[PDB]
C-alpha cells in the first residue's frame, strides 16, 4: 500500500531507535557487571538494510576507552551521552511522523 510506503521510513527509524534505546539501557544496567562487553548497533547501516531488504540486528562491540581489571567494557560517559542523543533523536522521529500523519488528516478534513 502507498500509505505504508510514504510513512515507512520514519516508522522503521522510530522502531530502530527504540531497539537501540533498549540496547543502551542494557549497557547502562550492566555498568558494574564483570566481563560484560558493551554492545551497540550502527544505526545508519541497519536502517539502510531495513529499507532495502524489507522487514535481527548486527550487535557490534564498542571499542573500550580504558582497561578495567574486571573485564567491563561499559564506559559510562559515552553511554550517557549516547543515551541522551538517542532519546533526542527518538523525539525527533516521533515529531516528524506525527507531522506527516497530521498533514494527511488535515488534507482529508473537509
Amino acid at each position: 500500500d502507498r500509505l505504508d510506503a510514504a510513512l515507512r521510513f520514519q516508522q522503521e527509524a522510530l522502531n530502530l531507535r527504540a531497539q537501540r534505546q533498549e540496547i543502551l539501557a542494557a549497557n547502562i544496567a550492566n555498568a558494574d557487571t564483570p566481563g560484560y562487553q558493551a554492545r551497540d548497533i550502527d544505526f545508519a547501516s541497519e536502517l539502510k538494510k531495513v529499507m532495502v531488504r524489507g522487514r535481527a540486528v548486527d550487535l557490534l562491540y564498542r571499542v573500550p576507552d580504558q582497561p578495567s581489571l574486571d573485564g567491563n567494557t561499559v564506559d559510562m560517559d559515552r553511554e550517557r551521552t549516547q543515551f541522551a542523543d538517542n532519546s533526542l533523536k527518538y523525539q525527533m522521529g516521533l515529531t516528524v511522523l506525527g507531522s506527516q500523519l497530521k498533514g494527511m488528516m488535515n488534507v482529508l478534513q473537509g
Binding site: 562487553q37 548486527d58 571499542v63 573485564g71
Partner: peptide
C-alpha cells in the same frame, strides 16, 4: 580503532599480573 568506535570483534580480555 578510535577509543569509542564500533567494532565487530570483542576486546581481548584484560588481566593484571603481579609479576611477569
Amino acid at each position: 580503532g578510535v577509543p569509542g568506535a564500533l567494532s565487530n570483534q570483542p576486546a581481548p580480555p584484560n588481566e593484571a599480573p603481579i609479576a611477569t
